[PDB]
Amino acid sequence: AVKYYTLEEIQKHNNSKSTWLILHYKVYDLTKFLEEHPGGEAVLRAQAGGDATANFEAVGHSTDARELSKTFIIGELHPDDR
């Protein structure tokens, strides 16, 4: 099924193990991609656990990168949040 995640639940995934984040109300686990991500782990980590939409777009990310993101899609932002 799809499953949605609350800001809370996503928040708990900001550290040492699980880097989740929200881009455009869509939740992405990239925790295993930290080193792999050619923008550094640190910035992903720092932005983990919440809205990183503005950060993501402010940096800017190609079509490839946008499509890549979907491969790391776990679900969406809970309809209670938005």
Question: What's the closest the beta carbon of residue 31 comes to ligand HEM, in angstroms?
Answer: 11
Judge whether 8 and 78 are in contact, CB under 8 Å. Answer: no
CA-wise closest residue to 73 among 7, 20, 34:
20
By CB under 6 A, name the one of 10, 22, 28, 77 that touches ligand HEM.
28
CA-wise closest residue to 48 among 33, 66, 64, 67:
33
Binding segment toward ligand HEM, per CB under 6 A, in 2-10, 50-58, 74-82: 50-58
Structure tokens at 76: 């969406």
The binding site for heme consists of 37, 61
**Applying CB under 6 A, which residues contact ligand HEM?**
21, 23, 28, 30, 37-39, 43-44, 47, 52, 55-56, 59, 61-62, 64-65, 68-69, 72
